Structure 1
Amino acid sequence: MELPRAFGLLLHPTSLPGPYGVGVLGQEARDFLRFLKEAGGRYWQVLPLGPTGYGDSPYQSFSAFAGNPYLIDLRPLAERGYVRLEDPGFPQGRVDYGLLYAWKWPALKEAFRGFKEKASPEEREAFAAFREREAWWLEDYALFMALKGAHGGLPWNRWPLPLRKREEKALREAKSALAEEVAFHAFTQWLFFRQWGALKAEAEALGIRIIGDMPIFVAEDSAEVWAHPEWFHLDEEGRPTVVAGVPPDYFSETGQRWGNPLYRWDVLEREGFSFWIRRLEKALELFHLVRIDHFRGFEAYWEIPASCPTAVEGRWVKAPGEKLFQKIQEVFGEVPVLAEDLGVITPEVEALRDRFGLPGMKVLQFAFDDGMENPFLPHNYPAHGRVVVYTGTHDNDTTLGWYRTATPHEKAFMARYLADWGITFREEEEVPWALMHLGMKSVARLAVYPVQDVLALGSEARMNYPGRPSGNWAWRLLPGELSPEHGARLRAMAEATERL
């Protein structure tokens, strides 16, 4: 794909400032887009937007199609008198998922009662129309969530057999018996996509394109795995016989075991990869470009025996990436995908990536731990510049935090390299800005930076720490923290690098 020479910012919606414990798709989101436009930015990147479970991770959703109910702005509903909102004492600059869980779900249920009581016939018909439209995934999702409250939050593969194996009868009775709870979940979905649709229109009016994110593998306990067990490696009991992960490296002698269920690609191939065509169809309705996590998994993936706690006993299994993307290109006539090609990737992966003109990634935090041959250093970027450069991703520490823990060699080499590119700095707080400048001077078409670096915040603002048991996906901006001055700095930098 032909990307214009520009820049953008990375910011998950939950991180937006505002009342009631979590960023939502409302005024503050619109204010952020306005800020981005004022700063001359043309891209906004977010993480997966579906419903989360234990861990609060956007990469382990109960559904690959649903929207996250925690992102719904309740104020518009409160204005129509559907609900009353109170602040139980939400913390500052961070999401407390426990309080959020305890307060938002009851509020959403309350709003639905208000709706069924005061909603106008128009709204009621719009809601009904929405349900008929998204039926292909919404019926399974809503019933899925409803059945969870009927079975103590148990995963689907632990529900009674009739429900687990989706016997037509059991499902008919369930929907009828839980009809009001099922309508509740579809209601949360209706408000989500409605509010995201309005926000997307606002971005487009401001000349901003949204970069979405989707994990290559879905979660084990999700509506789509429950409704299509045939597409995954499960046993007759609905349990994964194998799970996703990566082989042992110079870092993790045990490798990584993510636990995600694996696709039966052969089965998917015969069905024209319908599941994936649907994932892309939905993504294209929410974003302008979509990045796919662990992209190498389309060429080959590490298969791990589900019984094992580690990854040491796995094996590489080839996947039909070439056929999949040929299909994607057929249906959509374009592959608006950004490949997350970090880590160990082979020439086969590169060929698949460049074959469909998919942009790769470059992370500056990883460019100074070696020599000048480091592929993350700007002078080694491909001539066509079809890549996106970041200071750091959502999985890395903020750039300031990274610098404070960096090795003397990385720090000295980074200082010399920058100087070689005409960039200079005096204090640590300026390192994030120095690196953003380096990325903007590069040949990379897009430079996207996490808001934490624009603010030059430390490790306390890290979004996700792979391995750390808690405190992830919680950071939030404070009201007014992102000032117009910050915007003017970004604008001037973009202006000096032909990215305006």
Structure 2
Amino acid sequence: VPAVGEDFPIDYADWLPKRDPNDRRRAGILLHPTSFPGPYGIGDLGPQAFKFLDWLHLAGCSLWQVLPLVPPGKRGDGSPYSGQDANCGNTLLISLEELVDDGLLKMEELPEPLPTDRVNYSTISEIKDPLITKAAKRLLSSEGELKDQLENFRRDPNISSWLEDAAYFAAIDNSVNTISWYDWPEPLKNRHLAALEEVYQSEKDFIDIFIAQQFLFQRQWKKVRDYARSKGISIMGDMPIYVGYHSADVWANKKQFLLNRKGFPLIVSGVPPGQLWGSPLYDWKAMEKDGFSWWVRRIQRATDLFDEFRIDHFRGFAGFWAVPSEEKIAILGRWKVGPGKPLFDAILQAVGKINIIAEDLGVITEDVVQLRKSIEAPGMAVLQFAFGSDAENPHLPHNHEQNQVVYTGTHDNDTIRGWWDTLPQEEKSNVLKYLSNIEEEEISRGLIEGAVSSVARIAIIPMQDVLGLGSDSRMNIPATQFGNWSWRIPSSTSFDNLDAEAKKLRDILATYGRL
């Protein structure tokens, strides 16, 4: 500007305040693709994914939130948070119809329509796995555009940085079949170069098929993401802070983790009173020495899948609970100093600006708040947690801030109707008083409008709440072992029959500036 007291330009008054596009108010739906309806026992990245994104666009939503897309471990269950690998895609999400379109499968090979209500994780692999393998084998023997794209995918330096290790790990797991790589024969456990060369010779078809399957996943997921972008929809993903011990992530990167000389975890994850989670812990001291290269690669893959993502247990970057691996419960651990902002500095330098959502629920310490504010990451508000304490409860709308994501509830919460059904009478009248004496019969509308009308720049509604569903549609009960991750949109409900639900959401998005 000119000196104090001097004339501004004649056009000074045109200099109106700048709206930053990253402050745009948006609404989204939480819907894991396993939950899409269809005839093959599990939702997929096929026709229903495009039908869903058309419905979202009709509803005026500009965000779609999914759970982790990794292959769930089968040491039970279908949990997206117990993955076999941090970077691979769940091959059960591959659309059999899109592979028929590609010429990789024949109409005739498709199974007869399966029961539609719920995912049966005990049977779905045995049905789909042989068909995905058949398609992969046809791709590997093909000589067209898709073969060229497979070759470009497998030679991409970002892809090969995790996929080669993931494929060799899977080939060895299949062949040796121990509970953990801890018990592998020493040449495979300790990655003797000559032993790995022999694995490629004896397990070549397995490794090539595994890689082709990851290409088929990548190509279908990129078609979905491209379609979402064409409709102005961003995809928000999710990642656990910790990875599983029995994975290529640990076996191929042992010095990134706090293991003993035999590769057994010295300390494992959990929370004090408490909860023993049992993941191996990062050697954050050793990671700082190489510029957090392992974490940079994990974030690079996450940005390949998602526009933005949550990190579950974000508090672990500030401080983490470490339990001696011999211990069988959480009580006897210690809080350890997390890497803090220098991890996020390294990621910015290497990958540029990322939109990370900090999962910051429950008892968190001041250093977690300071770390989140230091990287300008939004935290969470969950309305189903707002009404059981006092008016300083940070989940109440009057305590929300602009740089925040508000939920009615996540995949870890009951549906609004299920939550209301088991809510104590004292807490119900509190809810109804807060939401301005609305009637018990309109509690869904009240909580959804409470989220959409928040100052929080992102509001997310689970699809179960749009469809008016009860506790029978809850995705997860934390710590329970059965009935989880299996909810599907019923076969009788089609996106083409939900125009009224889309209009009802669009009208409140318009009123509260999210459209």
Deviates more, 1:201-210 or 1:68-77: 68-77
1: CA distance, partners of 2:216 / 2:203: 20
Q: CA deviation at 1:116?
A: 3.7
For residues 399 and 27 of structure 2, what CA distance do their matches in structure 1 show? Answer: 20
For the 8 Å contact 1:395–1:464, the answer to whether it is kept is: yes
Contact 2:308 2:355 in 1 (8 A): yes
Structure 2 equivalent of residue 49 of structure 1: 69
What is the total number of aligned residue pairs between the two structures? 486
Q: Distance in 1 between matches of 2:58 and 2:193?
A: 54
The residue number in structure 2 matching 1:397 is 414
Q: Deviation of residue 93 (structure 1)?
A: 2.5
Specify the alignment match of 2:57 in structure 1.
Answer: 37
Which residue of 2 is the match for residue 440 of structure 1?
452
RMSD: 1.5
Q: Which residue of 1 aligns with 2:17?
A: none
Distance of 1:426 and 1:232 partners within structure 2: 51
Structure 2 unaligned regions, length at least 5 = 1-19
Structure 1 consecutive aligned stretches of length 4 or more whose deviation exceeds 4 Å: none
CA distance, structure 2, for counterparts of residue 323 and residue 8 of structure 1: 31
- Asked if 1:301 corresponds to 2:320, the answer is yes
**Letter of the structure 1 residue corresponding to residue 411 of structure 2:** H
Give the AA of the match of 2:105.
Y
Residues 264-287 of structure 1: per-residue CA shift (max 9 Å, x gap): 000100010001111111111111
* 1:138 aligned onto 2:153: no
Instruction: Report the CA distance shift for 1:53/1:75 in structure 2 as closer, same or farther (over 3 A).
Output: same
1:251 is aligned to none
Other-structure match for 2:245: 220
CA deviation after TM superposition for structure 1 residue 78, in Å: 2.4
2:425 matches 1:425: no
Structure 2 partner of 1:68 = 90
**Structure 2 equivalent of residue 191 of structure 1:** 216
User: Pick from 173, 190, 198: which aligns with 1:148?
Assistant: 173
SS in 1 for 2:330: coil
- Deviations 1:273-317, CA, capped at 9 Å, x for gaps: 001111111111111111101000000000011122210001100
Of 43, 51, 56, 1:23 maps to 43
1:432 is displaced (CA, Å) by 2.2
Instruction: Indicate if the aligned counterparts of 1:82 and 1:112 stay in contact, CA closer than 8 A.
Output: no
Does 1:5 find its partner at 2:25? yes
Q: Taking structure 2 as the reference length, what is the TM-score of the superposition?
A: 0.92
What does 1:218-257 correspond to in 2, within 5 Å? 218-248=243-273, 255-257=274-276
Report SS of the residue matched to 1:419: coil
Question: 2:139–2:212: 8 Å Cα contact kept in structure 1?
Answer: no
Partner of 1:97: 121
Deviation at 1:82, TM superposition (A): 2.8
Residues 361-380 of structure 1: per-residue CA shift (max 9 Å, x gap): 00000001011111110101
Residue 344 of structure 1 aligns with which residue? 363
Rate the CA distance shift 1:322–1:115 in 2: closer, same or farther, 3 A.
closer
Cα offset, 1:454, TM superposition: 1.0
Q: Secondary structure at the match of 2:28?
A: strand
Task: Give me the whole-angstrom Cα distance separating, in 2, the residues matched to 1:153 and 1:159.
Answer: 7
The answer to whether the aligner puts 1:467 opposite 2:472 as a matched pair is no
Between Structure 1 and Structure 2, whose CA radius of gyration is higher?
2
What displacement does 1:120 show?
3.1
Structure 1 position 268 matched with structure 2 position 280: no
Letter in 1 for 2:300: E
The residue aligned with 1:164 is: 189
- Structure 2 distance, partners of 1:198, 1:161, is 42
Mapped to 1, the partners of 2:144 and 2:60 lie a distance apart of 42
- The aligned amino acid for 2:414 is D
Aligned to 1:407: 424
Cα distance in 2 for residues equivalent to 1:172 and 1:432: 59
Distance 1:113 1:280 in 2: 31
In 2, the alpha carbon distance for the partners of 1:270 and 1:339 equals 25
Q: CA 1:76/1:89 → structure 2, altered by over 3 Å: closer, same or farther?
A: closer
For residues 206 and 281 of structure 2, the distance between their equivalents in structure 1, rounded to whole angstroms, comes to 31
Cα offset for 1:327?
Answer: 1.2
Contact 2:37-2:116 at 8 Å conserved across structures: no
Aligned to 2:147: 124
**Which residue matches 1:387?**
404
Q: Residue 252 of structure 1 corresponds to which residue in structure 2?
A: none
1:109-163 deviations in whole A, cap 9, x for unaligned? 222233344x233322221221111211111111111112112363222211110
Matched-pair contact (CA < 8 Å) for 1:245–1:302: yes
Are 1:492 and 2:507 counterparts? yes
For residues 255 and 134 of structure 2, the distance between their equivalents in structure 1, rounded to whole angstroms, comes to 38
Alignment partner of 1:115 is 2:139: yes
SS of 2:436's equivalent? helix
2:305 corresponding residue in structure 1: 286
Distance 1:90 1:238, change over 3 A: farther
CA distance in 2, matches of 1:114, 1:182: 15
Q: 1:426 Cα deviation (Å)? A: 4.2
**What is the CA–CA distance in structure 1 between the aligned matches of 2:218 and 2:139, rounded to whole Å?**
17
Distance in 1 between residues matched to 2:332 and 2:113, nearest whole Å: 47
- 1:454–1:486 Cα contact (<8 Å) kept: yes
**Partner SS state of residue 316, structure 1:** strand
State the Cα distance separating 1:89 from its structure 2 match.
5.8
| C-alpha distance in structure 2 between counterparts of 1:327 and 1:408, whole Å | 50
CA contact under 8 A between 1:433 and 1:453: conserved in structure 2? no
Summarize deviations over 1:19-53 as a string: whole Å, max 9, x none: 21111111110110110011000100001111111
Q: Please state how far the C-alpha of 1:335 moved relative to its aligned partner.
A: 3.5
1:260 match: secondary structure: strand
Please give the secondary structure, in 2, of the residue aligned with 1:98.
coil
Structure 2 counterpart of 1:386, one-letter code: N
Instruction: Write the letter of the residue equivalent to 1:129.
Output: N
Secondary structure of the equivalent of 1:77?
helix
Instruction: State the alpha-carbon separation in 2 of the partners of residues 373 and 77 from structure 1.
Output: 53
Provide structure 1 residue ranges, at least 5 long, that are not aligned to the other structure. Answer: 249-254
2:15: which partner in 1?
Answer: none
Greater CA deviation, 215-224 or 331-340?
331-340
**In the TM superposition, what whole-angstrom CA distance separates every residue of 1:59-102 from its partner, at most 9, and x where no partner exists?**
12111111110111111222415344444663223111121111
TM-score under structure 1 length normalisation: 0.94
Q: Cα offset for 1:481? A: 4.4
Task: Map Cα deviations across residues 200-229 of structure 1 (whole Å, 9 max, x no partner).
Answer: 100100001111111111111111111011
C-alpha distance after superposition, 1:393-438 (max 9, x if no partner): 1111111111111111211100000016xxx2342xx322210101
